[PDB]
Scaffold this active site. Structure first.
Site, PDB file in Angstrom:
ATOM      1  N   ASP A 152      21.944  10.008  50.308  1.00  0.00           N
ATOM      2  CA  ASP A 152      22.375  10.908  49.249  1.00  0.00           C
ATOM      3  C   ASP A 152      21.259  11.886  48.930  1.00  0.00           C
ATOM      4  O   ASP A 152      20.110  11.659  49.299  1.00  0.00           O
ATOM      5  CB  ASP A 152      22.769  10.126  47.982  1.00  0.00           C
ATOM      6  CG  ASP A 152      21.651   9.208  47.482  1.00  0.00           C
ATOM      7  OD1 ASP A 152      21.355   8.217  48.186  1.00  0.00           O
ATOM      8  OD2 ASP A 152      21.081   9.468  46.389  1.00  0.00           O
ATOM      9  N   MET A 156      13.396   2.407  46.369  1.00  0.00           N
ATOM     10  CA  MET A 156      13.050   1.402  45.386  1.00  0.00           C
ATOM     11  C   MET A 156      12.179   0.255  45.927  1.00  0.00           C
ATOM     12  O   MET A 156      11.940  -0.705  45.211  1.00  0.00           O
ATOM     13  CB  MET A 156      14.346   0.849  44.775  1.00  0.00           C
ATOM     14  CG  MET A 156      15.368   1.970  44.374  1.00  0.00           C
ATOM     15  SD  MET A 156      16.769   1.418  43.233  1.00  0.00           S
ATOM     16  CE  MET A 156      15.644   0.686  41.822  1.00  0.00           C
ATOM     17  N   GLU A 157      11.680   0.349  47.158  1.00  0.00           N
ATOM     18  CA  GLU A 157      10.916  -0.773  47.729  1.00  0.00           C
ATOM     19  C   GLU A 157       9.681  -0.401  48.578  1.00  0.00           C
ATOM     20  O   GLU A 157       8.793  -1.227  48.748  1.00  0.00           O
ATOM     21  CB  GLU A 157      11.821  -1.648  48.599  1.00  0.00           C
ATOM     22  CG  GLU A 157      12.950  -2.361  47.861  1.00  0.00           C
ATOM     23  CD  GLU A 157      14.234  -1.549  47.785  1.00  0.00           C
ATOM     24  OE1 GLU A 157      14.476  -0.668  48.650  1.00  0.00           O
ATOM     25  OE2 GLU A 157      15.005  -1.807  46.845  1.00  0.00           O
ATOM     26  N   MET A 217      17.571   6.957  41.197  1.00  0.00           N
ATOM     27  CA  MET A 217      17.229   8.292  40.718  1.00  0.00           C
ATOM     28  C   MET A 217      18.329   9.315  40.616  1.00  0.00           C
ATOM     29  O   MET A 217      18.605  10.010  41.595  1.00  0.00           O
ATOM     30  CB  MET A 217      16.156   8.904  41.624  1.00  0.00           C
ATOM     31  CG  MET A 217      14.922   8.044  41.655  1.00  0.00           C
ATOM     32  SD  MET A 217      14.032   8.054  39.880  1.00  0.00           S
ATOM     33  CE  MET A 217      13.431   9.872  39.905  1.00  0.00           C
ATOM     34  N   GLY A 240      17.086   8.541  48.724  1.00  0.00           N
ATOM     35  CA  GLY A 240      17.590   9.802  48.193  1.00  0.00           C
ATOM     36  C   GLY A 240      16.718  10.988  48.572  1.00  0.00           C
ATOM     37  O   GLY A 240      15.500  10.980  48.387  1.00  0.00           O
ATOM     38  N   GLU A 268      21.716  -2.556  55.290  1.00  0.00           N
ATOM     39  CA  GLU A 268      20.504  -1.964  55.848  1.00  0.00           C
ATOM     40  C   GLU A 268      19.897  -2.836  56.952  1.00  0.00           C
ATOM     41  O   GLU A 268      18.966  -2.430  57.646  1.00  0.00           O
ATOM     42  CB  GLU A 268      19.475  -1.727  54.739  1.00  0.00           C
ATOM     43  CG  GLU A 268      19.976  -0.847  53.627  1.00  0.00           C
ATOM     44  CD  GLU A 268      19.012  -0.779  52.452  1.00  0.00           C
ATOM     45  OE1 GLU A 268      18.503  -1.846  52.028  1.00  0.00           O
ATOM     46  OE2 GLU A 268      18.758   0.347  51.955  1.00  0.00           O
TER      47      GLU A 268
HETATM   48  N1  LIG Z   1      18.704   8.350  44.656  1.00  0.00           N
HETATM   49  C1  LIG Z   1      18.056   7.207  44.990  1.00  0.00           C
HETATM   50  N2  LIG Z   1      17.097   6.693  44.191  1.00  0.00           N
HETATM   51  C2  LIG Z   1      16.445   5.560  44.510  1.00  0.00           C
HETATM   52  N3  LIG Z   1      16.682   4.851  45.629  1.00  0.00           N
HETATM   53  C3  LIG Z   1      17.619   5.253  46.520  1.00  0.00           C
HETATM   54  N4  LIG Z   1      18.076   4.785  47.686  1.00  0.00           N
HETATM   55  C4  LIG Z   1      19.041   5.627  48.135  1.00  0.00           C
HETATM   56  N5  LIG Z   1      19.228   6.655  47.270  1.00  0.00           N
HETATM   57  C5  LIG Z   1      18.375   6.484  46.242  1.00  0.00           C
END
Ligand SMILES: Nc1ncnc2[nH]cnc12
Length: 242
Positions: free
Chosen positions: A204, A180-181, A159, A83, A17
């Site tokens: 995703d 997540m951040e 997730m 995500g 990243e």
């Molecule tokens: N599904 C997901 N959940 C949490 N963080 C992510 N970063 C990329 N995809 C993610």
């Protein structure tokens, strides 16, 4: 000739990243404090400090604090993968934060809003001009990607479980994407009176396909998010935040 520009803090959780912008760094110097590696240099003339934080809230928040306290950045850009929740969006698309919330904070038992920490706002707010900048930053075009502003949420669980995705979706129906951040960076920034913006690209669609889809399209999401960062840096050249 020379532009008079702010110093940008740039943070990503993992090496991909961050690897791209790390490369285009000119006059690169790398330093180490408190267990993190900070890469100071310039990108197209603008002064930046780039750090790879690690995964999750606490790690992103600690990197952010050091970024601000040690290097006195004028603002923080969080870049990386996310995500998708918003069905409109497809892998590779980009979401610029219009607000950011935790999805995994719950003190509703005491009257706070879902996602909200006591003594914090329910939603952390990115600076309008940083948002505006990345909006103009969509002259994107590599040589097609969709780019939007929307709500981004943040938790310390990746997730994937249909049930986790559903609960999050129920609490935060307007959510464009999850990671997540983001909110942790924003939380730290608020505490340190610093402007932030979160820029993230879809690696995703959040759910059953997420782990291998993420691994497949992390490099794509890094490329796309990193680009919008470079553009945004261009739009901010010679400017200061309101
Ligand atoms: N599904 C997901 N959940 C949490 N963080 C992510 N970063 C990329 N995809 C993610």
């Amino acid at each position: 000739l020379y532009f008079q520009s702010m110093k940008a803090g740039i943070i990503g959780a993992m090496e991909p990243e961050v690897a791209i912008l790390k490369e285009k760094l000119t006059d690169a110097k790398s330093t180490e404090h408190a267990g993190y590696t900070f890469h100071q240099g310039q990108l197209d003339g603008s002064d930046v400090v780039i750090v790879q934080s690690g995964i999750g809230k606490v790690a992103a928040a600690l990197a952010t604090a050091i970024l601000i306290d040690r290097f006195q950045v004028d603002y923080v850009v969080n870049t990386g993968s996310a995500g998708g929740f918003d069905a409109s969006l497809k892998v590779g698309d980009i979401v610029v934060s219009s607000e950011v919330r935790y999805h995994d904070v719950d003190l509703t038992a005491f009257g706070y809003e879902i996602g909200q920490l006591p003594a914090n706002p329910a939603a952390f707010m990115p600076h309008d001009d940083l948002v505006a900048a990345a909006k103009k930053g969509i002259e994107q075009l590599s040589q097609n990607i969709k780019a939007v502003t929307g709500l981004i949420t943040t938790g310390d669980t990746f997730m994937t479980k249909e049930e986790d995705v559903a609960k999050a979706r129920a609490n935060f129906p307007t959510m464009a994407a999850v990671e997540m951040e983001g909110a942790a960076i924003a939380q730290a920034c608020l505490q340190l009176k610093t402007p932030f913006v979160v820029i993230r690209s879809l690696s995703d669609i959040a759910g059953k396909e997420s782990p291998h889809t993420f691994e497949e399209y992390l490099e794509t999401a890094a490329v796309n998010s990193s680009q919008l960062v470079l553009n945004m840096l261009g739009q901010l050249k010679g400017k200061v935040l309101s």
